[PDB]
User: Fold Nucleosome-remodeling factor subunit BPTF from Homo sapiens.
Amino acid sequence: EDAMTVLTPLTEKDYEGLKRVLRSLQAHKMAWPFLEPVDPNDAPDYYGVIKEPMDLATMEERVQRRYYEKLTEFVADMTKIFDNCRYYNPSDSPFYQCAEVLESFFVQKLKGFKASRSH
Ligand SMILES: CN1C[C@H](Nc2nc3c(c(=O)n2C)CN(C(=O)OC(C)(C)C)C3)C[C@H](c2ccccc2)C1
Assistant:
């Protein structure tokens, strides 16, 4: 529940489940802008505006290194991806439209992850 999301440390099973949320996100049609971090070669000024950059491969690495102790931390990193994108980009950007779609998809998958967890 909300009680678990905050209090319950991520169990090695939960870490299996988060790799599967993450893979389904890497598999979405509209995840392509976010699979890897923003090439500082190709967008030099981005890292001088975005304070907390994040991307899907960085998140997979933090999962592999069991870097998250609670699920709130995982959700917070994911949310950076979409918030940074909509902030940096004009709304007519294809990166923006992908953030809106894929965040909505992530919300669903997160409900699945929480419901499966309290069982
Ligand atoms: C690793 N790179 C990272 C890229 N991801 C990304 N790049 C930029 C922004 C962003 O928010 N993201 C998420 C903001 N941006 C930008 O300033 O665009 C303005 C319109 C000027 C506002 C540059 C996509 C790139 C790529 C490109 C084509 C096909 C596949 C991958 C793969």
